[PDB]
């Protein structure tokens, strides 16, 4: 049995707010640790809060 998760929730709601993780400014930022969402949730910054 499967429904919605909770990582997907705040990921989708944070990507609703203009963020991104791949092509953020113009450079390829997939590997850069201060941009993908899992680090923003483990650091748990002002934004996810």
């Amino acid at each position: 049995r499967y429904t919605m998760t909770l990582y997907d929730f705040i990921k989708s709601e944070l990507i609703k707010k203009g963020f991104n993780e791949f092509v953020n400014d113009n450079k390829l930022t997939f590997y850069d640790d201060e941009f993908q969402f899992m680090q923003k949730m483990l650091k748990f910054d002002k934004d996810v809060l």
Binding site: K27, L28, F30, Y31
Partner: protein
């Protein structure tokens, strides 16, 4: 001369492993069931993940290298009439 005994001090440590290499079975035992833990799928995508990102970045940053390489094309284009008139003033030196 009788020099270069670097092929020769290996000898008492090259017969040694040949001695203790294949004469083992009266001296040791085959028991105890040692476990072997060898590299599930997460180490496989470890082996693949750094390998793909180290060329993922190195094709993401191909644009600035290529931007250099079609910048200096136009640098050659704007340098060309200077080189043409410089070539022209060469031959008329003997020409005049």
């Amino acid at each position: 001369e009788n020099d270069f005994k670097y092929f020769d001090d290996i000898r008492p440590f090259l017969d040694e492993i040949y001695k203790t290499r294949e004469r083992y079975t009266p001296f040791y035992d085959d028991r105890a069931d040692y476990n072997t833990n060898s590299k599930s799928y997460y180490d496989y995508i470890s082996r693949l993940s750094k390998l793909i990102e180290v060329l993922a970045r190195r094709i993401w940053d191909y644009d600035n290298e290529l931007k250099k390489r079609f910048k200096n094309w136009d640098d050659l284009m704007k340098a060309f009439p200077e080189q043409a008139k410089d070539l022209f003033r060469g031959w008329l030196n003997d020409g005049t």
